[PDB]
């Protein structure tokens, strides 16, 4: 179906299929030498050079080697530099180059590759859509937006562009404008629209505007395997971890951490108040669009398993204390932070990204009335000097209706059933 052989390559088709036969038989090093031979003897042959690239790609998998993949990536480029390359082959080679650049994390190189592809193939909608993802992957949502706006001008019912356009709208807090794009997009069934991110955000946008259809989509996303439950909608998960919204210390096994937080709560409180009074800039406003209204700021000591040395200058004894507990300081999918919330604050229902952490809250300054936190179907209050533990991969919601500030200390821990192997290896979040 794909014509990958130019006029000259047809005259050596037999030698080309022989080396490709070797590659599909898994005979990778024999196949590497064979495509090298063809390359040295026919250095202009696009199909030969692609063969060498695909072998180097497979070898990078056999060896799990980034350096070998870096060479494959250059050879895929070489294919495109040669004369008389058939369009099917040029597109296959540059597409895979971009895919492997992203896999390594060269998202800026991927973007240049993708821009070239769109220039070479200006009627291919799927490439313009891939370019959008390129821009999303480097956090350039303004250029991604323009890309899917171009695509939707020409093909208004391209669903991939509709769910990605929705996602962007929603990230810009255009909740109502995003709901029809996400809904119609998912409903299109086009490749790339059955993704947990889009169910996640569609239901959340509906919850925000007050549409009881929201849980219809959470049910569906659950039915299609994106969510472990209708209530627990995290997307970076290890399957099989125990799942309950509220935990006791004993249930977690981190009883020594919990005792240290409760015994030494006042030194933690006092260092937080000192920062509020003399270094309030260390408290950064929440910036994940989780607030309906109000004021909510966090002062973070550890994130992604890494101590913030400047921040720990503002809470030095607290950071000394926590160092004894690698179940939190090495939780690379969690944080350690103070969190201040003031009256008139409502945090939208939301879910954290991963089921691999549990969240501890130590009460530090808790007004007598007006502060509560719901996780799933149960609402609780904090207590000064006491720890509450919840799984923030379950939906949860917070209110602050007191007459003065509420300060807590937040300590993320590795889910207790995760092995030491998993805790060393899971990518950070």
């Amino acid at each position: 179906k794909p014509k990958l052989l130019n006029k000259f390559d047809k005259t050596i088709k037999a030698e080309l299929d022989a080396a490709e036969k070797l590659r599909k038989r898994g005979k990778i090093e024999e196949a590497v030498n064979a495509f090298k031979e063809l390359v040295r003897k026919y250095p202009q042959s696009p199909r030969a050079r692609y063969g060498k690239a695909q072998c180097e790609d497979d070898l990078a998998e056999k060896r799990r080697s980034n350096e070998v993949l870096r060479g494959a990536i250059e050879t895929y480029q070489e294919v495109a530099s040669l004369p008389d390359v058939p369009a099917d082959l040029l597109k296959l080679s540059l597409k895979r180059r971009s895919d492997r650049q992203q896999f390594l994390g060269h998202m800026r190189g991927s973007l240049l590759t993708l821009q070239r592809l769109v220039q070479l193939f200006p009627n291919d909608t799927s490439l313009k859509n891939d370019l959008g993802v390129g821009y999303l992957l480097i956090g350039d949502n303004d250029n991604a937006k323009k890309v899917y706006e171009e695509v939707l001008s020409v093909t208004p019912n391209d669903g991939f562009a509709k769910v990605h356009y929705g996602f962007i709208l929603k990230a810009q807090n255009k909740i109502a404008e995003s709901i029809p794009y996400l809904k119609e997009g998912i409903e299109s069934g086009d490749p790339g629209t059955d993704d947990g991110r889009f169910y996640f955000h569609l239901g959340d946008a509906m919850q925000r505007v007050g549409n009881k259809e929201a849980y219809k989509w959470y049910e569906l996303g659950h039915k299609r395997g994106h969510f472990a439950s209708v209530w627990q909608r995290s997307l970076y998960n290890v399957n099989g971890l125990k799942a309950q919204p509220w935990w006791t210390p004993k249930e977690t096994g981190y009883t020594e951490l919990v005792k240290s937080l409760e015994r030494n709560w006042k030194l933690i409180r006092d260092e937080g108040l000192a920062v509020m009074d003399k270094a309030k800039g260390l408290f950064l406003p929440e910036d994940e669009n989780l607030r309906e209204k109000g004021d909510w700021s966090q002062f973070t000591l550890w994130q992604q398993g890494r101590r913030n040395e400047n921040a720990c200058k503002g809470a030095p004894k607290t950071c000394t204390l926590l160092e004894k507990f690698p179940e939190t300081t090495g939780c690379r999918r969690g944080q350690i932070k103070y969190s201040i919330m003031h009256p008139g604050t409502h945090v939208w229902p939301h879910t954290g990204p991963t089921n691999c952490r549990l969240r501890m809250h130590l009460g530090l300054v808790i007004p007598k009335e007006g502060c509560k936190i719901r996780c799933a179907n149960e609402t609780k209050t904090w207590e000064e000097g006491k720890v509450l533990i919840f799984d923030d991969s379950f939906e949860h919601e917070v209110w602050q209706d007191a007459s003065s500030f509420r300060l807590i200390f937040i300590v993320d821990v590795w889910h207790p059933e995760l092995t030491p192997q998993q805790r060393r290896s899971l990518p950070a979040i």
Partner: peptide
Amino acid sequence: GKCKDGLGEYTCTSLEGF
């Protein structure tokens, strides 16, 4: 841009290879 309390980024992990 990182996913701390939510799922607002397009991707929450950072691709850095094998």
